[PDB]
């Protein structure tokens, strides 16, 4: 319904700042790319833009479709997951970051991904790097979400596998060996 960063209403925007976030309410499809850069939480001193309130990211909970790629390089320190995208389902990825990645979660303090509704990733690779607190990512079977032969996943430089098992942050006994987006029995992809 609405465009993405760099297209249309976001012609001269590099990320989702406190100026253009108000245009995503009741939007179900993004016709472009979504950039979540660190400028959204440290603010912009040049434009006097304050940090986006961490309770304001719940506006994107109506999003279900992204034609381009989703680039997440920042997240509020108060939120442990990404359930602001708990209803996002499809990332087509006709346009990619450097022509390779359609989903990038880089250096976040999140404890879980929480992309529970994400069922399809049409085209593009998925890189998950630099997240010191993240879990559940290495258990997700990304072959279910893929649609193009050869889509790769880089789960690198993140929290150790035995580190998540030490805190009991694994998938529930009530779901398949396909993975989970969190500890709750609802985050499980299949059962």
């Amino acid at each position, epitope marked *: 319904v609405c465009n993405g960063i760099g297209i249309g209403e976001f012609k001269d925007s590099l990320s989702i700042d406190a100026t253009n976030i108000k245009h995503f309410k009741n939007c179900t499809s993004i016709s472009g790319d979504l950039h979540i850069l*660190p400028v959204a939480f*440290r603010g912009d001193s040049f434009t006097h833009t304050p940090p986006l309130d961490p309770q304001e990211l719940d506006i994107l909970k109506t999003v279900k479709e992204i034609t381009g790629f989703l680039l997440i390089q920042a997240w509020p320190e108060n939120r442990t997951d990404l359930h602001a995208f708990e209803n996002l389902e499809i990332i087509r990825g006709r346009t990619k970051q450097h022509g390779q990645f359609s989903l990038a979660v880089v*250096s976040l303090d999140i404890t879980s991904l929480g992309l529970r509704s994400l069922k399809e990733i049409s085209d593009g690779d998925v890189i998950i790097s*630099g997240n010191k607190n993240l879990c559940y990512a290495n258990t997700i079977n990304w072959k279910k979400l893929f649609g193009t032969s050869g889509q790769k996943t*880089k789960i690198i430089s993140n929290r150790g596998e035995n580190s998540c098992k030490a805190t009991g942050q694994v998938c529930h006994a009530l779901c398949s060996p396909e993975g989970c987006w969190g500890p709750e029995p609802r985050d499980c992809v299949s059962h």
Partner: antibody
Framework: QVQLQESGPGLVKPSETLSLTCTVS??????????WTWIRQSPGKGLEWIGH???????NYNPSLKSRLTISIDTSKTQFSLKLSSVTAADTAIYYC???????????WGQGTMVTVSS | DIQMTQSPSSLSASVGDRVTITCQAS??????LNWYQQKPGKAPKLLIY???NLETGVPSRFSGSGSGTDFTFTISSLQPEDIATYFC?????????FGGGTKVEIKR
């Protein structure tokens, strides 16, 4: 292309703080595609990954040096520094500042600086 | 706490010989494995990333292979300029670590 260069004292007294600064030339430290990393090498420990910092401010430290480590970034003069407090003779090593791309590779290394811990 | 073991610790070969060194990880690291070359007195140089891909500018006589725990680095035709110590490095999860290194020398 992009070159890295180390700077800092070569002799640090024990129990004090080692300080080093890497100046990036021919590029900017403001790219979200790289982790700006410090790496040291010594006889007995070999190549050891100290830690890196992102341009968002997020840091990742080696648990063996976590308690005494602090890495910051100054995008103004395109630099990022290293601070290692309470040093002992075990910290005597050659220290490199390295550009680690998020893809996962130490593609650009500095020339390396020698740091000696001794009274 | 991934342990990287390189083998051998040192070797000697003639010019034009095929050199093959191995790197073994204590756990499955997929293909998150890189190879570095450190010539005497210089900083390490990246030659192979993602176990198999050749960095641009590196001669074609260098290659890498492997996935999981066992990896191999191969020099098809050894040259006198290849005198260096070769390291393998993983990036599966934090913290990142290097191998012990493999010193390569020329027999003449």
């Amino acid at each position: 292309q992009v070159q890295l260069q180390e700077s800092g004292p070569g002799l640090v007294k024990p129990s004090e703080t080692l300080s080093l600064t890497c100046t990036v030339s021919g590029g900017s430290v403001s790219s979200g595609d790289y982790y700006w990393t410090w790496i040291r090498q010594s006889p007995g420990k070999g190549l050891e990954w100290i830690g890196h910092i992102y341009y968002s401010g997020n840091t990742n430290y080696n648990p063996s040096l976590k308690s005494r480590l602090t890495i910051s970034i100054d995008t103004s003069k395109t630099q990022f520094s290293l601070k290692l407090s309470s040093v002992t003779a075990a910290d005597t090593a050659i220290y490199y500042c390295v550009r680690d791309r998020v893809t996962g590779a130490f593609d650009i290394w500095g020339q390396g600086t020698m740091v000696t811990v001794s009274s | 706490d991934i342990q990287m073991t390189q083998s051998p610790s040192s070797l000697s070969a003639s010019v034009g010989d095929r050199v093959t060194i191995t790197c073994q990880a204590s756990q499955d690291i997929s293909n998150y494995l890189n190879w570095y070359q450190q010539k005497p007195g210089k900083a390490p140089k990246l030659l192979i990333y993602d176990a198999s891909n050749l960095e641009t500018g590196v001669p074609s006589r260098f290659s890498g292979s492997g996935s999981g725990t066992d990896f191999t680095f191969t020099i098809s035709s050894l040259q006198p300029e290849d005198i260096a110590t070769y390291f393998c490095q993983h990036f599966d999860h934090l913290p990142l670590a290097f191998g012990g290194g493999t010193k390569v020398e020329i027999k003449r």
